[PDB]
C-alpha cells in the first residue's frame, strides 16, 4: 500500500557547524520542500529505491524490526556498497565490495560507535552525499498520533561525516528476517532560519513556495504589512538552438605547410594565405609530438567552432 501522505513542515537541519545566537540566516542547500508528499510503504516488500540527491527516511515503529540500510550503485560484486547495520549495542559500517548478505573479498572499511536505536516513537534520518562524503542527521521525538507525520517543528543534528568517495545511486531497506516508514526526496532550495537564543532553530520559511513566502524572503522578516513590495524578475526561456555556418563545403589543404622539407630560413620566411575553406584542427593533433603547443591567442578547445576572415 504505497499511499501518499502530506509531510507538512518537517525536514530542516543545521547547515553549518557554527553557533549563532539570534539572527535570521539565509542558506541555500538541498532540503525537503514544504507541504510536499511522501510515499508510505506499509508492508514482496523492500523495493530498491533510487537515490537522486538525498533521502528523508522516517520511521515510527518501536519493535526495532528496522535494521540498517544498504547503499550501492550496482548492488553486486562489481561495485562497493555501504552495509550500515545496527547491532544490539553497536553500529557497524562497511564500504567495500559485497555480493549478497556473502563474499566481501576485495577491500575492508570499518567504523563502530554507539547505536542509532537507543529509544509511540518517531525517528528521522537524512542521507546526503557530496564531494566524496556521507552526511547523516537524526533526531528522535515521541508522538502518539499514529501513522501520520506530526504538524510540528523539530530540527536535526549531525551524527557522522565520514568520507568514502563512492558513487551512490540505489538505496534499500534491511529488516530482520525472523522478527512502516516514509521516503521523501530532497531538492535544491533556499531557506530562511530563526536561531532563537541558543542556536535552537524555532522557525523556518521556504523561499520558493508562495508569493507571500517570496516577499518574506526578499526583506529579512517574518511579518509584512500593507504594501506593494517588489520581488524577483521573470524572463521567458528559449527552446531550440539553430546554427547556420556558410554554404561552402570544400576543405582547404592546410597540410602541405605542415609536412614538407626545408621550409625556409628564419629570415626571408615564406608566408602562406589560407581562405575560402572549411577546415578542422583535429588533423593537427594527428601529427608529430609538439615541442610546445602552448600558444597565446585563443583557447584551443573552441578553435574548432569559429569563423574567420583569413
Amino acid at each position: 500500500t504505497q499511499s501518499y501522505t502530506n509531510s507538512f513542515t518537517r525536514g530542516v537541519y543545521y547547515p553549518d557547524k557554527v553557533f549563532r545566537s539570534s539572527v535570521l540566516h539565509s542558506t541555500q542547500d538541498l532540503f525537503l520542500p514544504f507541504f510536499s508528499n511522501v510515499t508510505w510503504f506499509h508492508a514482496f516488500d523492500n523495493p530498491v529505491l533510487p537515490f537522486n540527491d538525498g533521502v528523508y527516511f522516517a520511521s515510527t515503529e518501536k519493535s526495532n524490526i528496522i535494521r540498517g540500510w544498504i547503499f550501492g550503485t550496482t548492488l553486486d560484486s562489481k561495485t562497493q556498497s555501504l552495509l550500515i547495520v545496527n547491532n544490539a549495542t553497536n553500529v557497524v559500517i562497511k564500504v567495500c565490495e559485497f555480493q549478497f548478505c556473502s563474499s566481501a573479498n576485495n577491500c575492508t572499511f570499518e567504523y563502530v560507535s554507539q547505536p542509532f536505536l537507543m529509544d509511540k516513537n518517531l525517528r528521522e534520518f537524512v542521507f546526503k552525499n557530496i564531494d566524496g562524503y556521507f552526511k547523516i542527521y537524526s533526531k528522535h521525538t515521541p508522538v502518539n498520533l499514529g501513522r501520520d507525520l506530526p504538524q510540528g517543528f523539530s530540527a536535526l543534528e549531525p551524527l557522522v561525516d565520514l568520507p568514502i568517495g563512492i558513487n551512490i545511486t540505489r538505496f534499500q531497506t534491511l529488516l530482520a528476517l525472523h522478527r512502516a516508514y516514509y521516503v521523501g526526496y530532497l531538492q535544491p532550495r533556499t531557506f530562511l532560519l530563526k536561531y532563537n537564543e541558543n542556536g535552537t532553530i524555532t522557525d523556518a520559511v521556504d523561499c520558493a513556495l508562495d508569493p507571500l513566502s517570496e516577499t518574506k524572503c526578499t526583506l529579512k522578516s517574518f511579518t509584512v504589512e500593507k504594501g506593494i513590495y517588489q520581488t524577483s524578475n521573470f524572463r521567458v526561456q528559449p527552446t531550440e538552438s539553430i546554427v547556420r555556418f556558410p554554404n561552402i563545403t570544400n576543405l582547404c589543404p592546410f597540410h602541405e605547410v605542415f609536412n614538407a622539407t626545408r621550409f625556409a630560413s628564419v629570415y626571408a620566411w615564406n608566408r602562406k594565405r589560407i581562405s575560402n575553406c572549411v577546415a578542422d584542427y583535429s588533423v593537427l593533433y594527428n601529427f608529430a609530438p609538439f615541442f610546445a603547443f602552448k600558444c597565446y591567442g585563443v583557447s584551443p578547445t573552441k578553435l574548432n567552432d569559429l569563423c574567420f576572415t583569413n
Epitope: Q2, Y4, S36, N37, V48, P50, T74, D76, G184, Y185
Partner: antibody, heavy 126, light 105 residues
Amino acid sequence: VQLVESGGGLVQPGGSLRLSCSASGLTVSSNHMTWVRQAPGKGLEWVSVIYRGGSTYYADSVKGRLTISRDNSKNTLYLQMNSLRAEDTAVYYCARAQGGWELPGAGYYYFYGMDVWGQGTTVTVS
Amino acid sequence: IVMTQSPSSLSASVGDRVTITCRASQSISTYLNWYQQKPGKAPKLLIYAASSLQSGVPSRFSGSASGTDFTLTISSLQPEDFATYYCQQSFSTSFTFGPGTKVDI
C-alpha cells in the same frame, strides 16, 4: 482489443505532421501509452510517453519538437511533429504500458512492459 | 542506463536451446523484458519481469535473472523461431533498448 495508426507521408524538411493512433478495446481515458520510433535497420528508440494522470515525458533528443496529446474519449491519441531534420524518417508505432505509481519528487519507475502493438506508419522527409 | 547483449549473432539448428544474455549498468532489480522482432512486421512480447510469461507462448520460453545479469532460455528452437531479440529495461521511465541479437540457421 487492437489499435492502428494513420497519417504518414512524404514531407519536405521543416514541415508539420499529425499522426493518429486509434484504439478499439483500450480506453484512452485512464491508461499509459507510448510511441516507439524505428529507423531503418537501426533498432528501436522510445520517443514519447503519456500516463494515466495526463503528464508527458519526451526523450532527450526529440525535445521541444514533438508533442503527444490525448483525446477525451474516442480512443484516438494524436502525436504532432514540428520541424524535422531529415533524421526522423522512420516507422512509428504506438503501444500501451502496464502500470506504475507516482513517487513524488521523481517520475514513474516500476513498469512491466508493453502489451499490444500496432503495425506502424512510415514517415519520410525529402 | 546502458545494456548490451551477448552474443549478438546466434547460429544453431532445430531442437536446440538459446543462451543469449543481457548485461546492464546500474541496478534494475528484476524489471527486464524480452522482445521478439520479426524481420519486418512488428515486435512481440515474450518475457516480462525477467521470469514471468505473457501466456501467448508455451513453456518453451523462460527467463532467468542473477544479480544484474539476465538470460533467456528456449526449450526447443523450432524452425518458426527465427527473428531478432531485444532486452529492454523498465526500472525507469525512460525505456532503453539493446543493440539487437540475430538468429541464424
